[PDB]
Homo-oligomer: A and B are copies of this chain.
């Protein structure tokens, strides 16, 4: 975990993020887009639960990216929840929620759900 989490990660779509896993569960870094209504780099911040593991379990973690930077303001934010598995083929398996700001009437359709798997090699 932590040291093994620090570094560059890539998903299938092409998205990339660089993260630093701090000693006390913090995750800080940048996400750079590859395919959605995101463009460029965005700040990412999250947390991980280190014990984490005498039974080769994953390390739970999560992070958020608000889709606003100096070139785009998408009025939305995504949170990824999942776990880190280390080793030869270490990976972070996640499920995500993307919420867009809507009026009260359209609030029911404000959140999309999906999944992403990140690896240290692309892809």
Whether A79 contacts B80 by the Cβ 8 Å rule is yes
Residues of B within 8 A of A13 (CB): 108
Distance, CA A97 to CA B115, complexed state (A): 12
A121: Cβ under 8 A from any B Cβ? no
A45-B26, A67-B49 are known contacts. Are A35 and B79 too (CB-CB below 8 A)?
no
Q: A interface, how many residues as a size bin?
A: 35 or more
Partner among B45, B61, B80, B96 whose Cβ is within 8 Å of the Cβ of A66: B61
A97-B95, A99-B82 are known contacts. Are A107 and B58 too (CB-CB below 8 A)?
yes
Distance, CA A75 to CA B57, complexed state (A): 10
Q: How far is the CB of A119 from chain B (nearest CB, A)?
A: 15
Partner among B36, B50, B81, B107 whose Cβ is within 8 Å of the Cβ of A79: B81
Q: How far is the CB of A58 from chain B (nearest CB, A)?
A: 5
Distance, CA A119 to CA B81, complexed state (A): 24
**Contacts of A40-95 to chain B: CB distance below 8 A:** 43-53, 55-68, 73-83, 85, 93-95
